[PDB]
Amino acid sequence: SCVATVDDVIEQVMTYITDPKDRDSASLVCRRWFKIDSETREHVTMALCYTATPDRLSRRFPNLRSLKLKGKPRAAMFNLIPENWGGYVTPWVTEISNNLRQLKSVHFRRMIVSDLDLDRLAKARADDLETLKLDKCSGFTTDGLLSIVTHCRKIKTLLMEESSFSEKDGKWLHELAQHNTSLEVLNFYMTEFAKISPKDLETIARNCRSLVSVKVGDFEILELVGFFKAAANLEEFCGGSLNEDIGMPEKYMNLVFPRKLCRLGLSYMGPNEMPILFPFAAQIRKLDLLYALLETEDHCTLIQKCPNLEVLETRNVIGDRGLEVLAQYCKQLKRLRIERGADEQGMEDEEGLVSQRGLIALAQGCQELEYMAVYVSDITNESLESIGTYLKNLCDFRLVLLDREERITDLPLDNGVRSLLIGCKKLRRFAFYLRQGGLTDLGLSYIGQYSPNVRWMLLGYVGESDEGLMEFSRGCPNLQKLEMRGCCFSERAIAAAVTKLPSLRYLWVQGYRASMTGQDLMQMARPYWNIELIPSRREHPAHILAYYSLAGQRTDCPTTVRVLKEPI
């Protein structure tokens, strides 16, 4: 017996380190520690799939149990990125098929998944695949689905939210009904399915005792009563469809909602059907009024009933008035999102605008907020000051102001932004999209200067000249990903700022002072740094996308995409 070293005990200890950023470190302390991390890492996420070879991954982490790949850039979620752009998943499944023999969970996000490659997935992994997440993907069909539900008989979680595919039939759902037991979560939330029987969804609920969440297409809620009755342990339900004909004023007044149901959002819900929630609103903790059909008043009467609500997502109809209701009724709120509604026929009402008024009201009410994302119609430096004044543990903050309004109160926001970034020092993600005169080179340099923890930034029409970009660039200690559109910055301005940024690994840009040369961008050509240029699909300015990759340049570029490689 010699003295006991750390070496004699590290194999055991490693598996108690969960934090991805601590494994990141542990792997770098020496050769043995690196191997031990390598063989024990369970989950890995690639923010961009083109960032490394699928070979490189399987070599470094032979024993992955869970994997998550992202393809197309965030902009794709706004119909700004060509469909053919990339993110094909096939190289990765043929890698999983051969070298990740341990994988039980797969999550593809904004990628291209084909019928072939998921039949390949299905057959290669079979019963071992507990979870499959097709998050906002395209390129497959119900055949693909039918293939994974017949070969993976033990699927616990299955997800297709916002995916676009070709619907040929419904035998995929029916096959779940007839044979699946293990299902825990089932999600096809933003999806046009027109050939699936609700009877099948009902028989699934009857068979999967562990069924906890389910989100759904445009099913008629009435056809789901059989479901709801059988879905005992159900905690979350988003989706469905509330269709009111006048011939039944009391159509939806006999709804038996599962007892445990505490996270939800019915689609198309009007004021007439809204009442069906009251009998248990004290219990609701998450609300998705995103696709609800109710007006600024109706919002207030409902929010008012949910004191324990800690997450709300809704359109800007919520109104300043609504936000005020939310300010002293739901103190427990942690996440709030306000996507922009119909900005065509006026607003959705005459209170359906949000402004400094509601903002500052909210800042005082819910000081527990950790994520706040708002499409606002008018602001004030003062409002921002109160943000960074009350809700300290804001982690994700996103603000976008609509061009709808003509004159906005006080416009240059330099000093508001400043106290915000200074109070919310827990901030890690930050989005700030304005109108032209919105922020000055001085205010911009504030951002670089007072955002030490921010790793992602989306920036609107900020700055006035290349001065503000360069000033900004000497800051941002931890900035990794940077997206900016609608900017007055020049090609050589960008290029020079990228070199000054210490942490930057991903950059997307739409709108910038170009040049026929194109050679201005070149002055940022590091090694391992790929740059690409784009048009747009679903008058579109050229996009710039650049990212680090230990792979080299992708083979799969569309024709519509150009890769820069020094003097052409």
Partner: peptide
Amino acid sequence: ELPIARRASLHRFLEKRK
């Protein structure tokens, strides 16, 4: 002229509205 791009999920819903 860079128009505020609408998140696809909503854009789809706003038309299923009318």
